[PDB]
């Protein structure tokens, strides 16, 4: 009577269909697990207690198919286990929650249902499914509260939201890895009671728990005791002691039996793209601190560039001063751009990997979704960085040169953003990705036509400058600023062999090549955390 018991025992969202089964027969795992064999049916709750897991992968991961090669046989619903069969019939809830902070529970559930339910279902059916999922896990009092890690919800509430997300498509087999990790005693008791109530229907729920101290062991239906990969007991927990005393190993008074026995040893692509871009926009436009920091740094750099090369006053800006100003305008943005893009990409790697492995989308709509989601704030950044400096430096007046400069800066920064995206998708860690990105950036910086004259390069630096967007940006700015004012200064230099539209097409081709590289990296390389 120490725990809360004024709860509702009604089932609002049950499973409709045939009962599911799971069979493991003489399974052995290497690179530990020896002679694992059990049989569970729908309607029962199996908890694997003890020291389970050889290395970085748990027992649930090796029985579900992840992870190191198995040497047994697993049967799912009478049929042998297979990756597509596991994806279609088995749902997994890990111990690390990965949800968007700027979203609420209802919006996230609606997005997951729209990305999971078939296209033939109407909006009313999706709304009814979301309402049933909310009422089943008693999340009606927090359906309009954000899941931000920001106050947001609590730990148990976030776990319930994750379980509801993984339970929206009505799975027949559910698996949980440490659901009560980092929760309070009452919260863990309530979560175990909720999982037991979910197992009360027509579902097969498996749970992995390390230490069921006092009540988690008492609320269990079926338990599996493991020691160094070897099973000891398999059956009802309430009789476990009665089994051990039947062999000659009694449990002492005032001692947990578990620890004492452990230490002894459809819908389509366009719809998915629309939902992804809408979710990304809704999650990005609600992050006030990040947008404010980006705008502040953009305005700071732009205004300090404008004030350092202030063209108004007594003396006007010279030729070399204008060249240095254009080179700095071209070469200062990439650092902050790459840093922000790499940080934003590595802040979503685990979530992207989980969404790609669980089968929501397959690297088709995510690409264009991320592009069109980064497009608007990047364009605002480009405006704030490029337009309130053209007037401070007192450059060539007019509308066409100003618009051409703005478009060239926008295209160059977009190419830099795509390059940073590709660098993030190519390497698994933040440090090596940032190092390779800064190396490429400094290589393209040295390949410019401002420091080494763009002519003292024999074969390789010239070929690098041929694919360097900074050199093309500097040449385009020089042609916009000095041509038809004027051509002889560009003629004595080597910045007059390529017209404006040619430079624009070269920048577009470089952006397309970087996009192709990013797509190949996303499709052929796993985004493992």
């Amino acid at each position: 009577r120490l725990f809360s018991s004024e709860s509702d025992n009604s089932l609002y969202f049950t499973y409709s269909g045939q009962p599911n089964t799971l069979e493991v027969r003489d399974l052995n795992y290497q690179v530990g697990i020896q002679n694992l064999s059990f049989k569970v049916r729908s309607g029962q709750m199996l908890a694997i207690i003890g020291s389970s897991g050889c290395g970085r992968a748990s027992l649930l991961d090796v029985i579900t198919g992840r992870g190191k090669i198995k040497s047994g046989q697993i049967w799912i619903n009478g049929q042998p286990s297979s990756p597509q069969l596991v994806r279609k019939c088995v749902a997994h809830v890990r111990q690390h929650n990965q949800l968007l902070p700027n979203l609420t529970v209802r919006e996230t559930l609606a997005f997951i249902a729209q990305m999971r339910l078939p296209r033939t279902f109407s909006q009313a059916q999706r709304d009814k499914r979301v309402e049933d999922v909310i009422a089943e896990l008693r999340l009606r009092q927090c359906a309009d509260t954000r899941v931000g890690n920001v106050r947001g919800l609590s730990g148990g509430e976030r776990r319930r939201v994750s379980i509801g997300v993984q339970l929206l498509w009505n799975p027949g087999i559910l698996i949980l890895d440490e659901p009560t990790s980092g929760l309070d005693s009452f919260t863990a008791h309530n979560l175990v009671k909720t999982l037991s109530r979910l197992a009360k229907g027509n579902r097969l729920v498996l749970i992995s728990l390390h230490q069921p101290r006092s009540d988690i062991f008492r609320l269990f239906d079926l338990v599996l005791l493991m020691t160094s990969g070897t099973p000891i007991y398999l059956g009802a927990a309430q009789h476990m002691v009665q089994y051990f005393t039947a062999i000659g190993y009694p449990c002492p008074r005032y001692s947990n039996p578990a620890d004492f026995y452990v230490d002894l040893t459809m819908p389509g692509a366009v719809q998915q793209f629309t939902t992804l871009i809408r979710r990304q926009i809704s999650n990005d436009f609600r992050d006030l601190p990040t947008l404010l920091i980006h705008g502040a740094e953009a305005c700071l750099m732009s205004m300090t560039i404008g004030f350092l090369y202030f063209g108004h006053g007594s003396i006007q800006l010279s030729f070399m001063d204008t060249a240095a100003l254009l080179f700095m305008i071209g070469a200062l943005i990439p650092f902050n751009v790459i840093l922000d893009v790499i940080s934003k990409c590595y802040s979503e790697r685990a979530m992207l990997y989980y969404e790609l492995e669980d089968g929501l989308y397959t690297t088709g709509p995510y690409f264009f979704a991320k592009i069109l989601g980064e497009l608007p704030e990047h364009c605002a950044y480009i405006i704030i960085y490029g337009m309130p400096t053209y007037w401070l430096a007192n450059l060539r007046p007019g509308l066409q040169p100003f618009l051409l400069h703005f478009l060239l800066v926008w295209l160059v920064v977009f190419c830099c953003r795509i390059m940073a995206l590709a660098a993030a998708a190519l390497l698994p860690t933040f440090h090596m990705a940032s190092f390779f990105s800064n190396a490429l950036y400094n290589s393209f910086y040295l390949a410019g036509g401002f420091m080494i004259n763009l002519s003292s390069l024999w074969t390789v630096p010239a070929w690098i400058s041929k694919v360097s967007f900074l050199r093309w940006c500097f040449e385009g700015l020089m042609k916009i600023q000095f041509s038809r004012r004027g051509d002889k200064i560009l003629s004595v230099m080597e910045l007059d062999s390529y017209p404006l539209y040619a430079i624009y097409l070269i920048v577009i081709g470089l952006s397309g090549g970087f996009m192709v590289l990013y797509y190949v990296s996303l499709r052929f390389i796993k985004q493992k955390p």
Partner: antibody
Amino acid sequence: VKLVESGGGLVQPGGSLRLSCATSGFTFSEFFMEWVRQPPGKRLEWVAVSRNEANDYTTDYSASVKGRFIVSRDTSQNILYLQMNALRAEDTAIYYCARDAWMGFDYWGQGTTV
Amino acid sequence: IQMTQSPSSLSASLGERVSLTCRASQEISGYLSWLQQKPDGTIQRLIYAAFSLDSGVPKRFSGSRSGSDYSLTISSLESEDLAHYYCLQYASYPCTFGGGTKLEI
């Protein structure tokens, strides 16, 4: 969707009584069935609930009448039955028979005075 | 969760607009419904989820939410509006009803 109640009367304290609720126009096994009384001094209080086929026809009652009121259902004729024991202490009401509680109290009946 | 309904009594006539208020002690996230009890004894739900209306109800009733106060507004008062009104919450167990409102004209 029609709900009609019957079986009301006047009974001295210490006895027992059984009210009936006839349903029409929907599946009786796929929906909840609730008894919600309304005494005159009271405003509105739900007393009994019976779940659908998915919950093994489980029943539940509030702490005010836990132990004396028993709800049952007949699926052959789709009839709710409410058996009250030791009435008339403070159990004088206009008991109503409703369909859904968790999805909003909709399609109310007419109520019978006890 | 205690539901405070206002007002307990109100006087109006043909053509005017009435607005009843229901306040919850906790957060229900818009999971509120409105029940109407006719003088004969017929009870019927008019609005569910506090924003959507049922089928077969006149379009003069509507519901809104300001902060923590759920407001049921009925416009173009007619003779069909002499009854009792209650607000009901179903987001938490057990379900609790409102205090009541005697809409008399």
